[PDB]
Amino acid sequence: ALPLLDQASIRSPLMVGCNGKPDSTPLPVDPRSLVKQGVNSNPNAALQFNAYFVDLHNPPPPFVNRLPPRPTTCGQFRASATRGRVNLEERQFFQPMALATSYHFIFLQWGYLIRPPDFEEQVSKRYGLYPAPFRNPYPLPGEDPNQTNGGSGQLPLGLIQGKDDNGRWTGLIGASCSACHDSRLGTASEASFKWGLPNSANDAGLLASDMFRTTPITALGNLLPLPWSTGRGSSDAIGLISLLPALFDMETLTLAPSLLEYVADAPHAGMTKAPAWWARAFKTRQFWDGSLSSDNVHSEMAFGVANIFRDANARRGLEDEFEDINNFLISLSPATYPKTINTALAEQGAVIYHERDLWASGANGAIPKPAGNGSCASCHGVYSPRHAADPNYLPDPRLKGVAAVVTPIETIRTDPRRMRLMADERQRRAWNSGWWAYNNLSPSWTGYPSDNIVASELRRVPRAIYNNGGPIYSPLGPNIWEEPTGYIAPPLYGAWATAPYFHNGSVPNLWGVLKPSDRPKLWKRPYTAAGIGGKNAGYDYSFASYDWQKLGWKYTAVACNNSIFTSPFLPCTHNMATIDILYSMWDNVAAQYLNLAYQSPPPITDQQIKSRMVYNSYLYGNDNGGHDFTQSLTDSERWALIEYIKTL
Template sequence: MKIRHSGKAGLWLLALALGGCGEYGGRSDGLQGGGSVAARSLEEHFSGKVQPQLDFCRTCHVPGAPGDVENGHDFMLAKDRSRDLDNLRASWERLGRNNPTSRILRMSSGQETPHSGGAPWPVGSAPYKNMEILLKCFENGAGCAALLAGGVDAGTLLPLLAEGHRGGHAWSRYCEGKDDAAALPVSPVALVKPGVNAGKAVYFNAYYKNCHVDAAPEDAAPRTCGDWRGRIERGGVIMKGNGVQGAAGNFIGNYPAAAVIPGFHLTADAYNNMWRSWGLSKRPENYDQLLAARWGVVLGPERNPYPLPGEDPNQTDGGSGQLPTAWTQLREADGRWSGKLASTCHACHSGQVGLPGEAGLPGAIYGTNSLSDIGVIGRDTLFAGYAIGPALTAFTQVRGLGNITNFQIFNAISALVTPANLLPYLLMQTSGGTGSEDPPVWWNYGHRPLKFFDGGMSSDAQRILVSAFTPLGAANPIPLNVNAAFEWIEQHDQDAAAWVLDRRSPKYPEPVDVPLAEQGAVLFHSKDLFALPANAGRERPKGGNGSCASCHGAYSPRFVHDPHYLETPELEGIAGYIVPRDLIGTDPRRVDGNDQEVSRTFEKDWFGYPEQRGTENDCGDQNLDRIRGDRENGYLAPPLYGVWATAPYFHNGSVPNAWEVLKSSDRKPIWRRVSAPNETGLDVVMGFDPSFRRAYDRQKLGWKYEEIPCGVGGAMPYLECDPSDPMKNPLLEQILSVIYANGGLAWNIPNLLQTPLTNAQVEERKIYNTRLYSQDNGGHTFTDALTDAERKAIIEYLKTL
């Protein structure tokens, strides 16, 4: 992200001041400095101790700025700082002088509300004391000299925007330039315990649990920078794939190709010939690119080879073809290439923002997606002989989404191998399906004490992170030996987690309007949305200051270092608030599906660390009644590093851009992202366009799309709707919703009947229909109270994170 200053300084310099105005609840001490020398005159006291703090007010209280409204005219400054003293005196007069305390002080300290700037000068703070002295001098010039001795050095305001790029795990930043022997500090998320940040502007109700108490050395947390680096390096081998020796594949761990049971891998020959099921007459020259587009997977910048038709992989260093990151070629124990291909985590967890040649764009990104169509991957690989294709197909109805963290499926392993768990598992299937979800980004993994959209597990619960690698498809020595498979997970989960935690969010690639972003920083951290008239009567969170930061965490240096926001700056960027289901109002199917029956079943599962059940660090389902206490279940507000690159938004990917997150009336019931242009002349399916230049909406912060009119027909009957009432679900959708809501695996099974067969059916899967089960785009409507100008400022600020 490059920062530029707007040429319209006179217009946007004020924008900065939404920092000192608007309905903001919260305080922003954010000062550096100390010591004090008494001023010799009123003018010296003003210029040295009062005027520097007025720059915070100037962002709003000048002509043309947000404070230039009817109820803000009594306190007005000017762009020209030389007139500040006269303007301040005039404002003091208009506001009733000292009566006995000036309204300037009462509003800026929170004694009188509403004040759009919140309480930047708490009672007793240096800015408050200095302004109080000045205003008393206005009233009693003769006694001013005695008052001046009480002046305090207010220090320097910390910046509103962070220098450089944050994000990434705190340990990775800490270890930059340090020796391997350097001891690691406590991980910031481990500080999020009950009682943390009580009474502060940022609210936590989701707490970290250490799932590795008394763990064996190979599974214990790293202690030094060397340990951390070693784990990241080993984890990268497991997680990245790319055909390296030791890379893992889904359901086969990192066992050599000779140990993989048929049906858990795809041969290179079968992969080379999948074009036959697309309806083509011959293999396209740009087959690798077209397959990646069709599947919505990424061709990464690193070599990831497979043998083309007629090639011997051991004579061509793996082959001349390029696999997407979603697949890797397996090696034999001696390092030879096998010509056998396995799927990886990146079918769901790698995406792309920007094309090669688009300067400043990250391109292929590990840890985000919203591009892939798992159903199409399952369809093609099933026809090519990959036995787990049907399972993949059953995970999704729409491109970019999946039923990924489905506990009803995870628990199946435990139910199959532990007879006592079988009956609870079967009873759990009466719980509703959790439906569609958009895979959460990996780079914020280290900034949340709990993980998954509903905060179901501690972020230290690493077993489930690599559950897709559980080597049940590997023989010699694991012919369906679950205990041995679990042992493999214990040996590798911490390394894999370290690599994921080390991911860093991408920088926004274009210059940012600094004054506007600074305005957004104050709005984001201080504006009490729930105090606005438009939200009157709405339930508000049980803690925090009602701002965006209250839920999503503090990022601005000025607020991160303000003790009214965080107990310690180490909590920067951490989001630990599970917003109650009805307060947030987004689609409830995920929360409802993972009900108490699911939670009780999962706590007995090996992936839920049953050995710590009932202890202080119980790592079972954190939404279980006995663990969560009086906290309501809901959705965990995500950290926002790299948020610009994570569209579409909400846990189910139902909103294509940040503007519509903040303004619900602009959301569309049926929409489709822009597809990449087809320049082949062939009847082939192209995926969503990842080009920043062509397909990214810079103003709304998300992906461009087209609204689909009601009544569009096609192979999928659930696309039909009544033009006179587009939100009325057709009978088929109503029936399916009832089935899905009353059966844990019901979501998956009917989807087998909807496997896309033709290109037309694959194209239909690009359409996002918000009337479908689990795909509602409602909720988060408390931000409707913002003005469009405020939304623009917040969006500009989000670009800096």
């Protein structure tokens, strides 16, 4: 009789299927693509999927196929995934922030007078980044990076110089996808790097603030569209989506700002933490709200499109590179747990995971219960091969580990600010009717509208009319931003490693997810020592800072206090928020491109840095409540479930 545990180095199903197989081998089925209407052939099964995959390559009628085919063989996929990884390491997609020489001297902006000899480490510490596992070069003053293979300086993982769309080293530094999407757990002596472990430590606001005070890349230029944060390990990255229609023609990606499609009063979505790329292969949808099909890469393209230096053709023309990025992400598997596991305890956990009804014996009466068996599995997915072969649990064994449930907010009840991001029909319609929704697949679509500002102004008006309930103007595409209803229950493969948890990174360990009463409202992880100069302590990421029992960061609880003399200053209310917490780069970028009053990024002070280094659940969007149906568990059930998660 099949195993309960399923520990695997190779998790990604295409990589499982291609392992040791020649290039010409027909690619394995992507199980995410099986999650379509009809999948739930047993309506009484423990798990009922509700977030369906949408195939944009061969779209439902009346849409037409206009995308190059996805890979059809193991060799095609592997070559694509290699190109994806090279793109992540060397291509400058994300908006450049600073000249290489300004970055070389950025200790000036930290308040140092001369370069400390630990400069390269202090960069990592200050900004919550890591020593990169690849050569990540930038040119020292005087060096021409196109004669010196990028330069002899090295950047941390998370920053990039890279190569522009003409294949040349740019001489400019910005963030990379890895600033948010990647991190090290364990020093490089303790652990190899694996892609797709979301960053718990990055401070996006502090990098933006520092960079803003360097020599402008463009002398008179506008503020840059770049993300901010209230602290570390989450950011307003997703705020970009709301910003997009303010700056860019939504059909052509021409930079042509307009008032007509920007809802300037959509509520701020809060901070979100990056989901884990290394389980992309199990997720039918993108984004914390499950809003888009995982077949789509236009969402993955946002930061490359939002770069102010590209023209409409170049922005749209990033698509091939992003399909290769996407294939690298689907090729990923999570790191395997590096410590000891009690196999028998993990098997008790496996059972609890798949079978224990959290609403059993009248528990959690006040939390609406979804269709299914009330177990972890009824939302997150079925992991156990034994349960995967049982139609009381899963209708198809190929669906093992698939996360395709968006849990309604009335049940999940975690911080709701993020689920309001595209709540307004007007916003979704702007998206639905253009390039973002792949409206080139409409049967009514001819060609891209003209790439010119006058014509872009012409089209804005009937677009806004459609957005507000009027006649169709631009055709609709199949890559619809779904109306939000809740949050995706994400894959727990790899979750051992990815603390802190929930979409806002508010809960520092798995125990806390499992026991709401033990979640600290404010919590501080172990820091590194300050560097030479006495500043830039960072978050320590060595194994000693991780909690191998409760599965998460070691932390010290801290009390909120509105007294101004306290340090770190950690208010009990979002109302006492300081200027660095309230700032929105996206808001001011929009204001400035729309010829409205705008506020430039505040210089973030060292006292504010002290507060950004502690997680505060009281800030807007930062609540640590929710997923409370785990309170019905016993502590014995919780330890078993933790041991089981170690095996995922």
